[PDB]
Amino acid sequence: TTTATRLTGWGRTAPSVANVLRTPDAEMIVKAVARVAESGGGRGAIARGLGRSYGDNAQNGGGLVIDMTPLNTIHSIDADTKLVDIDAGVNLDQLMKAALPFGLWVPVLPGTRQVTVGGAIACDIHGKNHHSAGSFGNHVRSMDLLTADGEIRHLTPTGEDAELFWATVGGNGLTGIIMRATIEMTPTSTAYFIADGDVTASLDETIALHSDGSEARYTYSSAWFDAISAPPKLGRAAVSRGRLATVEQLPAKLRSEPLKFDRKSGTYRGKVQNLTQFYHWNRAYGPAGFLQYQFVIPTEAVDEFKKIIGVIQASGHYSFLNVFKLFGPRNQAPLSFPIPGWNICVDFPIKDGLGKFVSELDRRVLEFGGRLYTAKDSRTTAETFHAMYPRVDEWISVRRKVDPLRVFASDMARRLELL
Numbered sequence: 001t002t003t004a005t006r007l008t009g010w011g012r013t014a015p016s017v018a019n020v021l022r023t024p025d026a027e028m029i030v031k032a033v034a035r036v037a038e039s040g041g042g043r044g045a046i047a048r049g050l051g052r053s054y055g056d057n058a059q060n061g062g063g064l065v066i067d068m069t070p071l072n073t074i075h076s077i078d079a080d081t082k083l084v085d086i087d088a089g090v091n092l093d094q095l096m097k098a099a100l101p102f103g104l105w106v107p108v109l110p111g112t113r114q115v116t117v118g119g120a121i122a123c124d125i126h127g128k129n130h131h132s133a134g135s136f137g138n139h140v141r142s143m144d145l146l147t148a149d150g151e152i153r154h155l156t157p158t159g160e161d162a163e164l165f166w167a168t169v170g171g172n173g174l175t176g177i178i179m180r181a182t183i184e185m186t187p188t189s190t191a192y193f194i195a196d197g198d199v200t201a202s203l204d205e206t207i208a209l210h211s212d213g214s215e216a217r218y219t220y221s222s223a224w225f226d227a228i229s230a231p232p233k234l235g236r237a238a239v240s241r242g243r244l245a246t247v248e249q250l251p252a253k254l255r256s257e258p259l260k261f262d263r264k265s266g267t268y269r270g271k272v273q274n275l276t277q278f279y280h281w282n283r284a285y286g287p288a289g290f291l292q293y294q295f296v297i298p299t300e301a302v303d304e305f306k307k308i309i310g311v312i313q314a315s316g317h318y319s320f321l322n323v324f325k326l327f328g329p330r331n332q333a334p335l336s337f338p339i340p341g342w343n344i345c346v347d348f349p350i351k352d353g354l355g356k357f358v359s360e361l362d363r364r365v366l367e368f369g370g371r372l373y374t375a376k377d378s379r380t381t382a383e384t385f386h387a388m389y390p391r392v393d394e395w396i397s398v399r400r401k402v403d404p405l406r407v408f409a410s411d412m413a414r415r416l417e418l419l
């Protein structure tokens, strides 16, 4: 029933071997969890989606990994309530295609659409619209969680199991297997954005543009960011901002199928773009090529943020692929990554000294009240991680109640002592 398989995250690093269960039969999934539990726990089990997380949260060396991609049924779609009821293995591209004809839009879309609903919830993913829509967890209306007792429980964000619900959001699969969920989509009349572009010349200008109140005029905003140029050109950015377009805003040609599926001059106003145009290596060149690194610094620590940016460019580790964004308010999930503040993802070529240097970055992010993202990490320590997440003891306490025998476990769980 299972296949022994070498697994890595997307960055192709830190391999380990698991027995992988891959079945479309939910009852086989239920049985397998029971078998792990009735064996007393052992090396446990963890769900896996499309493996787009960069780190080691979707693998479990010497244990069971359940590939959830065969559970990919969209059970229902409701345009009045905006609710969509889908198996956890359905991916966002599939959901986007299925929901567009109903005038519904996936409420949080990350950099790639090849992620499962299960992985979207488990990592509480964020997108270009975080400051207006929060993260993926914000839009979960309910979910069915297969817990260690072999029971599938219906969780809601305000019901009696609210605590377990919010521990499951951002929980990295460690409260159990999400089987199915109900997502509240965002109403839309088109599959297009109307975008404004602006280019800044310095970190100070990038920061000023994000704090001048203009951000409140756009639902989506992010920026490509310069991390190599010495100051004052350090931190200059190419900012892409916009919102979903209405049909009347569409070019005449495009108005017939409005819900169709799919330096200096980078300044513009009212550009009409589809998803691909509006939104836009490690796998191709890994694990030898690149270390991805993502962090957020609280809004009020703006000078600490600039310092870290300064430290990065002076390091001699140079990243071209940089994404920057001002996060909005956080949600109630103890281990949710986003907090309001300055978010940046960088991508360092793997070079001598890199490891020691990012360990120093860790220290700075931590001291300044910031955090790393589990979906981008395969290397930090338990000590650093627990320190970045003041609600980790609270979260661990929920996990112990719902999984006393540690039926659910992963390489990440052991590394960061979340087990």
Ligand SMILES: Cc1cc2nc3c(=O)[nH]c(=O)nc-3n(C[C@H](O)[C@H](O)[C@H](O)COP(=O)(O)OP(=O)(O)OC[C@H]3O[C@@H](n4cnc5c(N)ncnc54)[C@H](O)[C@@H]3O)c2cc1C
Pocket: 010, 046, 047, 048, 049, 050, 051, 052, 053, 054, 057, 058, 068, 088, 089, 109, 110, 111, 112, 114, 115, 116, 117, 118, 119, 120, 122, 123, 124, 125, 126, 127, 171, 172, 173, 174, 176, 177, 178, 179, 375
């Ligand atoms: C090119 C690229 C761009 C990206 N951009 C973004 C971005 O803009 N914003 C962002 O927030 N993230 C981004 N990510 C990270 C990605 O969105 C998250 O890692 C997401 O969790 C991946 O989903 P997945 O189905 O591949 O899950 P996997 O990587 O397979 O698993 C990730 C975690 O989810 C858990 N999980 C998966 N399915 C279930 C389930 N059914 N039940 C319980 N737990 C489950 C796993 O146990 C694991 O802990 C990006 C990744 C890549 C490769």
